[PDB]
Design a protein around this nucleic acid. Sequence first.
DNA 1: AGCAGCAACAGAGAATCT
DNA 2: AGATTCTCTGTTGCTGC
Lengths: 327, 319, 338, 254, 258, 340
Amino acid sequence: SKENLPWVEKYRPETLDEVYGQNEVITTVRKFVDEGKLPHLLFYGPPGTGKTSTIVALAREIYGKNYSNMVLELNASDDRGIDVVRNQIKDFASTRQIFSKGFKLIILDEADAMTNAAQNALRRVIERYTKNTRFCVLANYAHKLTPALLSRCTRFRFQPLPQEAIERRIANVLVHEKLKLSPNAEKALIELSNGDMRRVLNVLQSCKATLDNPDEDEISDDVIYECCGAPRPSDLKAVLKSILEDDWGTAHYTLNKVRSAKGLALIDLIEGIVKILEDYELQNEETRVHLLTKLADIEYSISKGGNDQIQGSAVIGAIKASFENET
Amino acid sequence: TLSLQLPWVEKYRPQVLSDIVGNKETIDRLQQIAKDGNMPHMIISGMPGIGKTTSVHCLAHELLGRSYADGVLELNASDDRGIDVVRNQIKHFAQKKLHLPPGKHKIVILDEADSMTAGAQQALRRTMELYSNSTRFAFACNQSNKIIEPLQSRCAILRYSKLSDEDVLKRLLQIIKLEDVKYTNDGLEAIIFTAEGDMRQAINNLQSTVAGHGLVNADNVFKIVDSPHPLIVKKMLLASNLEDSIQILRTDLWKKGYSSIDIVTTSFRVTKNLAQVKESVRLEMIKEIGLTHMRILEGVGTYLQLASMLAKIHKLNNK
Amino acid sequence: WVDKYRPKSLNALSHNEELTNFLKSLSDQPRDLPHLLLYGPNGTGKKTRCMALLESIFGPGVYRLKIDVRQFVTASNRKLELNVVSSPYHLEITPSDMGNNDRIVIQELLKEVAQMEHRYKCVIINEANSLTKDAQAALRRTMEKYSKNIRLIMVCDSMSPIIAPIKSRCLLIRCPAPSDSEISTILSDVVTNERIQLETKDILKRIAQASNGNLRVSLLMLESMALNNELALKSSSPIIKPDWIIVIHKLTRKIVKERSVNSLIECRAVLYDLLAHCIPANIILKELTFSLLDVETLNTTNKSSIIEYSSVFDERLSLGNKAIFHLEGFIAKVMCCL
Amino acid sequence: MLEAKFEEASLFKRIIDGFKDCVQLVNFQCKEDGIIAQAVDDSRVLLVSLEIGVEAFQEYRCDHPVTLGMDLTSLSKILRCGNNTDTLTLIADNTPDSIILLFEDTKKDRIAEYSLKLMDIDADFLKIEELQYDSTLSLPSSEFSKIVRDLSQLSDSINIMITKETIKFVADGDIGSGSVIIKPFVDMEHPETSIKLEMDQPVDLTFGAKYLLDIIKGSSLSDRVGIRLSSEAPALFQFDLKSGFLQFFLAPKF
Amino acid sequence: MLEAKFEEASLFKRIIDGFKDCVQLVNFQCKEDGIIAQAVDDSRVLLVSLEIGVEAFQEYRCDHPVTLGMDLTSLSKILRCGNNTDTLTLIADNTPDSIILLFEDTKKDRIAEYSLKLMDIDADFLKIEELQYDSTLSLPSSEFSKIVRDLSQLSDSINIMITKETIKFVADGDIGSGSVIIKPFVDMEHPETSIKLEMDQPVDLTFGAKYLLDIIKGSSLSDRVGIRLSSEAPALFQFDLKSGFLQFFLAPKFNDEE
Amino acid sequence: SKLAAEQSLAQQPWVEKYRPKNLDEVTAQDHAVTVLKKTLKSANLPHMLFYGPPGTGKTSTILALTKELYGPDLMKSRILELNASDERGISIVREKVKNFARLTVSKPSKHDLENYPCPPYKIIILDEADSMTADAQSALRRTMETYSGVTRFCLICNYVTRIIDPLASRCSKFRFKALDASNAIDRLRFISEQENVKCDDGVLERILDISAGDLRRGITLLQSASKGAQYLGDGKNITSTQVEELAGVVPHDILIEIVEKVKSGDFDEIKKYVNTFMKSGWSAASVVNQLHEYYITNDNFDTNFKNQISWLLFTTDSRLNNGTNEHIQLLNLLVKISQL
DNA sequence: AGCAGCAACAGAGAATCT
DNA sequence: AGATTCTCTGTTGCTGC
Ligand SMILES: Nc1ncnc2c1ncn2[C@@H]1O[C@H](COP(=O)(O)OP(=O)(O)OP(O)(O)=S)[C@@H](O)[C@H]1O
Ligand SMILES: Nc1ncnc2c1ncn2[C@@H]1O[C@H](COP(=O)(O)OP(=O)(O)OP(O)(O)=S)[C@@H](O)[C@H]1O
Ligand SMILES: Nc1ncnc2c1ncn2[C@@H]1O[C@H](COP(=O)(O)OP(=O)(O)OP(O)(O)=S)[C@@H](O)[C@H]1O
Ligand SMILES: Nc1ncnc2c1ncn2[C@@H]1O[C@H](COP(=O)(O)OP(=O)(O)O)[C@@H](O)[C@H]1O
Ligand SMILES: [Mg+2]
Ligand SMILES: [Mg+2]
Ligand SMILES: [Mg+2]
């Protein structure tokens, strides 16, 4: 049953009308398929944007419910070498369908992990067998693909999910589940997503589990922040104010009590302070240079461990010394 | 839907050497060779999508006439091209008896010659030397340095260059006339700008824009085929003030879904190939772009690292 | 000799009485014993104290040990060859005898010893600082999965390269270097047992002042200078210094005397000759910097820059593999500073 | 539940030999009228389809169909314990995580029993067989194997061409070309050697030699092989069993 | 001196086939009552021990024992010249640097003679056989080979369990588990197919499948195999010869010990 | 059977003796165990990614969850645990992990369904995912994306940055918080009472203060203090000084001597005192941490001095976190802070 | 200090011929 | 029925990226 799959897998789009966020590419692909001229596609974009769902729904709309048989889907989990290409992909492209009549579809998902020799062998397979089969390459990084292979396909960039589409999907999930969500809670949820539907679905399931109730109540900002462990804008701005204006010992005490009262992480506070200070209209860019350099150094040091108190004091001192040049 | 139509790159693929709008010198050279005969061993190098495979295909077709089926041996990178293949099949084809006109020869086309192993390339030397009177070799590669010098010593070297704006514009105008498409000057200009000397990519973008919107206009081309990635990165690095570069990185690159690895790597390429600033400042910018890369390869790839890289580059440019 | 007079039990220790009492406390109940990590200066006597603690956890047969050999296969049939020190109650492995293949030996050998098993068999990991981060990560879960059959006693000189999970997974025991007085008392018993002739006792103190807490170096230097004075130490017996220390001192003299590229070439040559004779580059850098700071011709401004450059290039050497590439850079930076 | 006892473990071993190598995953389904199994190779050009009726077994009981998927390699690894003459019983509950293979000798003596781990495969049996094919022919399977083994050496493609009273196999590659021409004929001295051909329309199809080579294995299950060709669908090569058949559907090269 | 003539070179070739692969060095010793040989693998979990009495030979003369060590691989390389029906004579002086293998056909015609270089091995023959084992069983060796070949595919460990009137071989690994259960029985229609079992105490030991696979080779020397198991010592698998025997002693896995 | 397990636990060190067996034993990581308890009644366990400081209880939490889910019978049949002591290349991830994921779930027994929920999926956990290469990690993407109906993936790591972005997006991120005195004093007091650890008033809270968010190190220090107090047999209570002595903490007077040498003194005196201090074995990380606490906490230094001392201590800790020589780094730090 | 892709060599199994 | 030869598969080593 579908009630056992996680929310990321349960709510996977099955038709092209359930893929939100991407409109300019979805309409163009629908027109390509209706008019017949479907070229070799290259879906490039960040994780969680809906490239795999888009191509799966496309193959479903093209071949019907028997998609799992008329399409050759290869990914990084499967062995994709040059010999694998030579045998499997060439035998698939050269032959025809065993279930119906029509062009074939080869979905090379996550093809950014393929060997250079494999791409060099495939770039002539795409150019030779082009009247009976098509190629779809999904990628997160366009630098791992050879320029020859990159030039044979039409590139579609999957933009991050905007506010309207992600709110539409959230409303769809809140309709499918016996769940209510606060408006400010929804805004905070959209803020900690960066256009990643996977994160939204995961944390929505997690905060529904956090409710502890038969779901007669609502999900507020407190639930989201306590479940995702993300700092609140209130505590963020309080720490920033105490760092910018208050005394050194008082700033240290404030940072300690804020990061220990809710168990917040220093890296999340660093990213939040970076995001907040990005809107600050500042004087001569030397302060911004020092701030960015020191904050990136502290983040790279945190990414390897160390003393949290020493790193917090380093953040405080870096912000203070950076702002001391603004006078 | 039941079947698709042939793409314009394959449908309008040139079949005669006159239809090629590539490098005029080498094109007339190959045309005179096909007219007179006595085709020598050749290695055609260049960049993807400029008319290298089509050129050698047209040359072989025009030179062999109807005997193309039994006189031309095509081997691509999709087929096994190791030492065993060169030893058995290529040698059997070169030793094969075939009655040809007194001006033609058997042609062995080897696509993607830069991918053949060292053993096969070494074995091909005497293979092409002992049968150089009834078998000729034509290599098509992108990097001539990947082919050993002994093989390059026995053949001509044809280096294909990028296609100027005029040639791609003329070819696109011919395709539009042959297809009856509604277009405009700014749309074709945007297409050629996003092509970057790539004729195949230009025709592909044109066909995609036609099948997606019908009218080839700059707005449609820009909304379907995003502007060149390296140009926005160059404009970001060449910014004079830190806030302008930060806003460019935020809106154009980060808010549109470009990964940090692509941004930093495109950034490295732009710098390496930069010519506006001096050598020392370019080396310092490349050095800074490197630490950000090392930190991103270690999994610390975020917007703060790119912001710090830009800040360090500006500090270097800050005398 | 160092080996002829060495304690074999906890009651035979003659310095750090608080550490001996802590070891006796830890060995009172031996079955509920967690993993241990002995850290401190090199030459303090932690490897003797670990064996003395094993002598309290088990019978006196812990010292009757044997050397065996075990072969391993990496991806290549290359048979990594590793010798093992084994005892009927414990075993000792030194992953510092190979390159980046520490993880394979660690995981395979420890899994074999843990699957075969007072009730547990002790494991002594010698020189845990040379353990690569991947080998330490592999040992991280092996320390916890098999805690009723395998107990680790890791001997190291500095917990700086040891990862935080391993640090947390074992008790930490510090071994401070013995005071000059205890070293002098030990040397007194040694010279009365080895029948050495001392005109004045204070020379022994000077030996301590020349060893910097190292007992292994102290006894060896005492015996080396006892052979030059023919078993009769006088009031002004010269101090026997190792050859590499003299080479480093001459290198610092050359550094402070001449600062040029022509001298940088011979400095690189001296560094090559030192590295080719089984001398680590970190110790070379440490001794070079410490003896350069002792140069009275320089001032505080020079010494501060010297120590900063030495820290920077020590980080470089800990992050690099071509040690001379960092040593020559540090030497050039010091030349530019002076 | 699954409860199927083969008189001779050998029959099952030869059947599996047919799926062997050319496919990795097989989906079995037992039911009231027997057992069926389907396997498709990765490139999707070959489908191996089996049908064993109730009468092919010495004992068969089914009150509740069971579908089970498995790795063929794992299955064949275990399929060499049959002594050929051993008795083989396939056993599984209604919601299995494994399939039990039980080999026993006549006497109580030796009992080899295996418990093979199953794979979850989305049930999706194909029904691509045609009502009528352009041409139909049968001939001794050993003869078909030789024909395939001959030509295979010359090319990676073997063409089958059918015209009135003529069947022609052709391969053409680097070293040269080859052809095998056979004609329909009834041998009364023993009709298992005859070559029948019913042509409604001349056909001319090309197949990848590597696949025909996989298919010839069926010779070990039947004396004759039936080949049905069409320009509209995958070709069918069929090997009849006593109550059943092993079928190979192969898509022609485009 | 060493002077042992085998009627058929084949017997010696099959005997050496038994040491083959699983051991590298073999130490032979000829004496007044015959020839013995011992070989231990590198991990020391398997000992191969041979005994050939004087009566197994067509001619045997020994007035002075000789001990000689050699590389097994070198020996087998030379052990395919026997034509099986050829006559084989092993020859060596009292202080040998080599061992001479002399193959001759009935008629004076073909004489193939080899001079194999010897290795110096510290003489240290083991005597690990027990007086009584927990359980003893014999069964056709071809049956034992099949049992081992079955289970081997499933795991690197094969367990042998013995209870009253029951012998059970079991393997359990990744793809699943398997077991072969056999019961004692006397077949008068030909007793070489019977399965005997004498159990003084139930036993349950695990062995490394790679080693049992080496051991099954003895089938070529005898119709039956004797298996003696104990919880106190290496298991003994024995293949009888006419006047002699080939024995394999295998240490049970402790949990991980071949 | 069970009694042998009880005795082996009783003869086991306190770290493994008091390992959380149920989801209720988790004292401080409540946000994660609440979701884990809620999904125990449902059947929609998503792919999870535990990350946080070492010793926070990630492995213990996942073990307790798998136990409460499957029972001690299915605990060994529906779990695939891969640690850092095993090979986890592309070959292993493609063969073994994918074969286990593609396999069907084992049939539960009659006693399993009566007491445990027995979900229709199995669990594949990968402990210490920091050592996994990024290509072997990307190989797991579709493996965990397509076979989610039959298996669930649980990644465990300390640095969440070492895991690629797609894997971090596919799994639900669970951040384990540091276990300071506040949220772990209850667990420490429970461990002390269960072992009759007679201590003073401010010992346990001090122990966690030395632990810096690490309950494993705190339990180890408590066990060491209890052993040292039982060996003496005086019947007194453990003191905070006795605890900080064996914890590697430099005494207050020795640190005040360092402060005096830094404040007043030249390069030579500071170098000599550092050479003397390095003779007594102290961890440079602890000395740097104590100096940082003293300098930032003391309200007698200028803010301009405080920014510089914070940056210098940060640089020194970052350099020490790479395996450098403690003596050189400590001397450089003290010299740099003496010039201020 | 992986992998991979490789290619070559050796061993084992199956088939055919005497 | 046994022996020999040929073919196929697997493992190891070397080279290149
Ligand atoms: N545009 C979208 N509309 C609705 N749901 C979406 C959308 N994009 C992602 N999702 C959800 O996120 C899940 C994962 O989507 P995927 O297509 O697998 O992500 P992706 O774009 O392929 O990025 P990868 O796989 O990490 S490279 C889907 O099953 C949906 O539940
Ligand atoms: N000079 C040209 N004139 C007309 N069409 C061209 C020209 N060059 C390329 N094209 C088009 O581009 C398609 C592909 O050209 P190719 O010759 O295959 O590219 P290439 O120069 O060989 O670079 P590769 O194959 O990536 S190494 C042709 O089928 C044409 O449609
Ligand atoms: N939240 C907790 N509640 C109770 N005991 C805990 C808790 N966290 C850790 N412990 C104790 O610390 C021991 C180690 O737990 P682990 O789960 O291995 O720590 P960890 O988070 O895995 O650290 P690693 O493995 O270095 S990342 C457990 O056996 C407990 O005794
Ligand atoms: N308790 C002790 N009393 C006297 N000498 C000792 C004692 N412990 C160790 N020593 C000696 O002091 C020196 C210490 O150096 P070494 O043994 O190498 O240290 P470690 O045990 O840390 O490796 C050796 O000569 C050693 O035998
Ligand atoms: Mg995807
Ligand atoms: Mg080309
Ligand atoms: Mg853990």
